[PDB]
């Protein structure tokens, strides 16, 4: 569920930092919204794997893991520059 927000992000890390918003035949401010759409949809996908102590568990209802939390903080700590 974290691999559904990653390839939207590394496209958004390209068209914004490199400033390549001159490709689309549509309005580029509009197509930027649909990319920031999926970066906001995918942020919700691991809202459900978060425990009560704000810790991330691998399976649904399973025990918490230090591996996934470090991977949940790697992914979410990168979306912060583009989605609040």
């Amino acid at each position: 569920e974290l691999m559904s927000v990653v390839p939207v992000f590394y496209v958004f890390h390209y068209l914004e930092t490199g400033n390549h918003w001159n490709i689309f035949h549509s309005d580029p401010l509009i197509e930027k919204q649909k990319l920031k759409k999926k970066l906001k949809e995918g942020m919700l996908s691991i809202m459900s794997y978060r425990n009560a102590d704000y810790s991330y568990s691998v399976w649904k209802g399973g025990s918490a893991s230090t591996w996934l939390t470090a991977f949940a903080l790697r992914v979410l700590g990168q979306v912060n520059k583009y989605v609040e």
Binding site: E1, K40, E41, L44, S45, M47, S48, Y49
Partner: protein, 648 residues
Amino acid sequence: EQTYVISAPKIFRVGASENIVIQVYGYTEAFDATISIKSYPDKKFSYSSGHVHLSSENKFQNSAILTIQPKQLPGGQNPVSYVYLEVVSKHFSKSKRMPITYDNGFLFIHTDKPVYTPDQSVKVRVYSLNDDLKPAKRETVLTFIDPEGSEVDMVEEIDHIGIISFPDFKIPSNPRYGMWTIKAKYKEDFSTTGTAYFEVKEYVLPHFSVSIEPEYNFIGYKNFKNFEITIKARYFYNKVVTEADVYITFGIREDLKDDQKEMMQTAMQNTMLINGIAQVTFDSETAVKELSYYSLEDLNNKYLYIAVTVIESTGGFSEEAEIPGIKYVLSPYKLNLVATPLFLKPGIPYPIKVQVKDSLDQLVGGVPVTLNAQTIDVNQETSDLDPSKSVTRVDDGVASFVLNLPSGVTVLEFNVKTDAPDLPEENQAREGYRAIAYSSLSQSYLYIDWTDNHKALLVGEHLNIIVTPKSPYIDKITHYNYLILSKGKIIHFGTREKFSDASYQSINIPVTQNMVPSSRLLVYYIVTGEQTAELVSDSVWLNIEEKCGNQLQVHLSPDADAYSPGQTVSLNMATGMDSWVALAAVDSAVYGLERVFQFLEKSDLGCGAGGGLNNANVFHLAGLTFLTNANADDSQENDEPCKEILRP
């Protein structure tokens, strides 16, 4: 004698257009007045002003429309809590401290389905109106609240047309199941909020759908000895299980929010399913003997939790079902008062209309109700009345009584009580109320009587109201003056002269498209003596029909009672004028809404069906305030969470 009544709504709304009606009496030389809202507590900054001409052709009555815009109020560190409604002319200069609110407009959030499953899109659009019931054209900031109370998504959108279409909220592939909440909000200047609830439920599909459809949805005195419960199971459209094995268990519950259930570990039945249907019974009294409870006085407002596991004989599958609660009710009825003000008029009959609702809110007709009354006059001398019975009629569930009260009544203590034939008189529903007479120095009253009380008023037709005074100075009355309120805004006023020696007269009033959901009508007169004058007032609440301003209707062509899966049909919309029509085709099996006029009427200020303890309570309970020479308002502007009904 020269008096004036300047009628304003009880609470100014910021951004609205409030109508301020001034009526002066006992004048001959025409003149003018300036109604102006000044600031508080300084009277320096004038928000808006008006100019009215009180001349003879207007019958000395006019109205200015005032407006407090949100861009003229100091926000941030505080909201403004009071203003001054100030009037100045060459004959009078008064001012009154008026509270203001920011609660401007309405926000209806409309999702398509109430219940969603994972990986589905929540469609959502907001119907935004202002407090004059027109497209508000303000920006709205939706908020998505999960069961964990988190701001999981806050989307905002600008309005142009009144219908604010939002992007579709995508429920994830693994969501947090439970009740969600959408909270709409204007981004600036206003504390208007709208709230819509939906549910996210996990989709699992059964081998066969087991339903538990019991006898009644509440248990009192007749199902307390035997309660027939029916269990049905079927694979598909008509494929029904042939044999199965049924195990039932029961438990007592307090309420549906506390999910602890104390099971009765003796009433676990075991039956057999025969081609779909098994009828089981539950003797409740002998089974609740553990956790004693001993009676129907106890177990009152408690629930019954019925769990059922149907195990299929052939394949070996075991589908579970449940009922969350069947309320163990003491009496099968709830009594309230529909459209009866609890205020008397001395010498004038008192109409009482009670309503018998069952314990899941249905209008149970044919239910005999008995009324006993007690006259407590001024000298604290209780006098008993004759009891009167009547029958609850089945169309609206409302029984009807009339008490002809003696001339010197002060407090009526009447107690209603059901007289059903096959219930004990400890399981009959009863209620007790207390009505207080209208008080006035130099005892003089007004009783305005709506002619067709039983049926709703049709727009375009004419309201006919019969006005009776009960003064000792009847031949001093000159004019009857009225005000018509709708959605907390004065929409009409006028003055019919009194026919000189007719003891009572009738006023004819046209009902228009201003007063569509309902309306109030406050009539008064002025009886002047050698003392200060006094306004003598009374009001009613009207019931005008639901006729929208441009009648939309939709149709399907061809209109058949059965269609084909894949059939191309045409939707034929037809309005009265230009409009933006919002369409929604929802699978109707989800319901097992869009009621709006029972929520859009919550802009009305003041409650009850009229009346008051004194003069100013009539103005206050109608959603008005005023400033005169004759009387003062002196009304405490407290909360008062009143709960009146007004409608069948």
